Write a protein that binds this ligand. Structure first.
Ligand SMILES: Cn1nc(C(=O)NCCc2cocn2)c2ccccc2c1=O
Ligand SMILES: [Zn+2]
Length: 140
């Protein structure tokens, strides 16, 4: 699990969104595994606006924060899971590292702020849904 809180927005994995998140929906994209909902309280996170390829992510199945190199966001084939059939997932960044399904929501960050959240895994690679192109998260 995990979320990003920026301004009056909550960013979560689409597959883990709650009924309140759907009732207060702002934007969602199934092909990205992302959902943003509105909040009453202001958040404290900053979204990175950069093209960094190194940062650190939180891995709950290890209780550890790992420094990693990751690929730029791309369209990649992802095998079927408990939440989606096999399909192409867009805006997905990959790194060599450990992850398990319950690690989804773990934040990847660079020196500029939040890069994305854990979304996929397999083949010894952890995939992260990019949020740096969602410029509207910084305003209203
Ligand atoms: C972070 N992580 N997640 C998943 C997963 O089930 N993601 C659900 C969301 C999803 C996106 O595209 C397909 N399913 C997974 C699946 C098998 C093996 C490892 C992992 C893993 O490390
Ligand atoms: Zn950066």
């Amino acid at each position: 699990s995990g979320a990003i809180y920026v301004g009056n927005y909550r960013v979560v994995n689409r597959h883990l969104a709650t009924h309140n998140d759907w009732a207060n929906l702002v934007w969602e994209d199934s092909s990205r595994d992302l959902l943003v909902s509105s909040t009453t309280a202001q958040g404290c996170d900053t979204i990175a606006r950069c093209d960094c390829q190194t940062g650190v992510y939180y891995c709950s199945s290890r209780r550890k924060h790992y420094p990693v190199s990751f690929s730029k966001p791309s369209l990649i084939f992802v095998e079927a899971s408990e939440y989606y059939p096999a399909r192409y997932q867009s805006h997905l960044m990959l790194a060599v590292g450990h992850s398990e399904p319950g690690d989804c929501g773990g934040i990847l960050r660079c020196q500029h702020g939040v890069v994305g959240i854990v979304s996929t895994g397999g083949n010894g690679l952890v995939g992260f849904a990019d949020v740096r192109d969602l410029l509207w998260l910084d305003e209203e």
